[PDB]
Design a protein around this ligand. Structure first.
Ligand SMILES: CC(C)CCC[C@@H](C)[C@H]1CC[C@H]2[C@@H]3CC=C4C[C@@H](O)CC[C@]4(C)[C@H]3CC[C@]12C
Ligand SMILES: CC(C)CCC[C@@H](C)[C@H]1CC[C@H]2[C@@H]3CC=C4C[C@@H](O)CC[C@]4(C)[C@H]3CC[C@]12C
Lengths: 491, 166, 95
């Protein structure tokens, strides 16, 4: 253990701070073997370090997405697993916890390392070394083949599963690529299929709440009708309190997501803001303050965008919603920056000019800004003011603004949006699939007032006999396929 | 079109006031069938196929998002601006018409001085303009560009099948 | 004829519910040949099933647009057509 050996930012190389770990990470199978069969003192393959990592954790840590490193770590991982099987067949190394609490599989999920993750998630060996396998090929009657994926520590029924780690704990930017791989993809799809009624029931409840809010806001002044109005107002107050409580509970359960996750969810903040504004407006009405109505209409505006939140339940519209935000983030802000820099200077020049003759246009900065914005919205008044003393200068400034902000900047913005839409076609699909995974994981848990019962996934299929006793049971997920090439290879 | 024409003609005998809307609806729908008859050439046939494919692949999502933006902003504008310091945004239909005038290039964006919440109204109008006109329409243009690029070879086969059916 | 053998949505694999059809669909030219020259009782190459499909209909049914499956079904179709020509040149199987 030392500064050079710990994992930090600078001059370091973490390898597990163990001679066996170093030998495994340095690509020498002979040295790794020899340490194990020493008559003097064999090296325990289940030893840990200060962080608690084992030889298998260290391989995951040093893994990259490059082809050669992935191949090396995969081969070494498989070899060490077989060596552990032959040496110690009682203890299994895959389920060794860490000081943090993770396993070698969960480290791959939390660290964003995808190659070793996909290899470990779906692996199968030949006749020898069956027990240490994840994918099992069952009956092969013709070209139809049925695969069984091990659901251990990857199903959301447990406490800290792989899906929850990917959705709420992974630091990687492109952590969505992990939710579009075989097992996860199928499992998430069937979970979502089981959750259609509850999702659309939540959508209907929010729609009804928004309709009631709209009715209350519309029919409000500056008996039966008064009683209905008061009932609507109190119902809105309770609804806002409910939404605020839900948002606060979500924020408290995942205290640390707000840094990792902004591109994908980005609606919990909006829901929190809408609930806060609604509650604040309702409580401020009791004081009879004049700033009720702006707050109420702001909440009314923000509600329908959350209605658009609920709209991402279909493939076309979900990818469209993802693309909207990606276009906004990638290129709308640079255009606004340049646009306001152009606008402010020209508006100030127009205001400072045209103060002496030969109401008054460009009286102040706000009026000039409004006129120059009317230019971009297609309603720009471009006339040759005859009463001004600097008519030609004003006309030239207006023409220079028009040909440099309207002809150039807007069309260039269209071109940049075209490029952005072309570039991010495949990414939006995975982002939407991850969004669905997050929604499914959230709906699996109940609301802040009632908790759902955990429905286990997969069937209890016997996968043979191990070397410790007759039973060997594990929960597996079944998938059918019709593959003709693989079938014809096996004959 | 045939049903509307026959219904209008038979309804004329009753001398009902809803003759003229039905007749003009049939008149509108006839020329689109004239465009049907136009798909007898390669260039125009593939163009007609591409029009419908652009409509189906991406015009409906844009309309959905557009009306969701429009309705909320119109309702907010109607609920606001009911007290002073005719009247603009008198009802929901007038507000919707104004906000649609914004997208057709005729949006009246002025600083109403007689209102009590002038700044709030102006900010709402600006937020609608920079989020529906600058963003959504240009993004729609980009999506149509992508759709036209993606379906070049498919439209030819679709038109050939249309010719086979004819 | 059974639930697993009919064509439906779920756990099934349709092959024509005939031993000759099964042999043809399972890529074994030798077994297909041997069923035909049995002195005891040759397998009629024009026999049908409950749906009425023949050995050639079954190959079409199990066909996909994948390269390997298309190549297999094409080769088996041609071989069975030639075998039908040499065995029974009077009846034509295509119609
Ligand atoms: C008058 C005010 C409150 C309304 C303007 C909305 C404000 C908050 C801005 C800030 C961030 C913006 C949102 C960020 C991105 C998206 C995702 C997109 O798929 C729908 C529009 C939506 C939801 C935007 C709507 C407008 C927006 C919400
Ligand atoms: C006032 C009303 C009756 C006129 C509007 C037309 C209505 C019916 C809408 C509904 C579906 C639309 C049609 C569907 C798609 C096509 C194919 C395209 O190649 C020509 C336009 C055309 C034909 C559209 C014209 C407008 C349309 C016909």
């Amino acid at each position: 253990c030392g500064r050079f050996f710990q994992k930090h930012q600078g001059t370091c190389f973490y390898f597990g701070e163990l001679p066996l770990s170093l030998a495994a990470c340095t690509k020498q199978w002979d040295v790794v073997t020899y340490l194990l069969e020493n008559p003097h003192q064999p090296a325990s393959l289940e030893a840990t370090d200060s962080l608690g990592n084992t030889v298998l954790h260290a391989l995951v840590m040093i893994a990259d997405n490059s082809p050669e490193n992935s191949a090396l770590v995969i081969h070494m991982y498989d070899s060490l697993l077989q060596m552990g099987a032959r040496l110690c067949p009682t203890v299994q190394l895959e389920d060794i916890c860490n000081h943090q609490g993770l396993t070698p599989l969960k480290l791959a999920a939390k660290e964003g390392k995808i190659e070793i993750f996909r290899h470990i998630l779906q692996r199968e060996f030949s006749g020898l070394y069956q027990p240490l396998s994840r994918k099992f090929t069952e009956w092969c009657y013709g070209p139809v083949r049925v695969s069984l994926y091990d659901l251990s520590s990857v199903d959301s029924w447990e406490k800290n599963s792989v899906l929850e780690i990917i959705a709420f704990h992974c630091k990687s930017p492109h952590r969505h690529r992990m939710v579009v791989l075989e097992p996860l993809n199928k499992l998430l799809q069937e979970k979502w299929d089981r959750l259609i009624p509850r999702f659309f029931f939540n959508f209907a409840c929010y729609l009804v709440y928004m309709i009631i809010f709209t009715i209350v806001a519309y029919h409000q002044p500056s008996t039966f009708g008064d009683s209905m109005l008061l009932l609507g107002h109190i119902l809105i107050l309770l609804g806002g309190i409910y939404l605020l409580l839900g948002q606060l509970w979500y924020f408290w359960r995942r205290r640390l997501f707000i840094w990792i996750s902004f591109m994908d969810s980005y609606f919990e903040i909006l829901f929190l803001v809408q609930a806060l504004l609604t509650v604040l407006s309702q409580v401020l009405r009791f004081v009879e303050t004049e700033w009720y109505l702006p707050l109420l209409v702001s909440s009314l505006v923000l509600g329908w965008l959350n209605l658009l939140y609920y709209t991402r339940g279909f493939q076309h519209t979900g990818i469209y919603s993802v693309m909207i935000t990606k276009v906004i983030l990638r290129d709308l802000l640079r255009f606004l920056l340049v646009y306001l820099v152009f606008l402010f200077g020209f508006a100030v020049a127009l205001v400072s000019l045209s103060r002496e003759a030969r109401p008054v246009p460009y009286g102040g900065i706000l009026d000039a800004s409004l006129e120059l914005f009317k230019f971009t919205i297609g309603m720009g008044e471009l006339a040759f003011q005859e009463q001004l003393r600097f008519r030609g200068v004003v006309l030239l400034l207006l023409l220079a603004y028009v040909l440099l902000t309207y002809v150039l900047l807007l069309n260039m913005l269209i071109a940049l949006m075209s490029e952005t839409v072309n570039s991010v076609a495949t990414d939006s699909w995975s982002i939407w699939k991850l969004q669905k995974a997050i929604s499914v994981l959230e709906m699996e848990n109940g609301y802040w007032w009632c908790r759902r019962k955990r429905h286990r996934a997969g069937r209890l299929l016997k996968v043979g006999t191990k070397g410790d006793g007759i039973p060997d049971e594990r929960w597996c997920f079944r998938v059918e396929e019709v593959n003709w090439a693989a079938w014809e290879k096996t004959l």
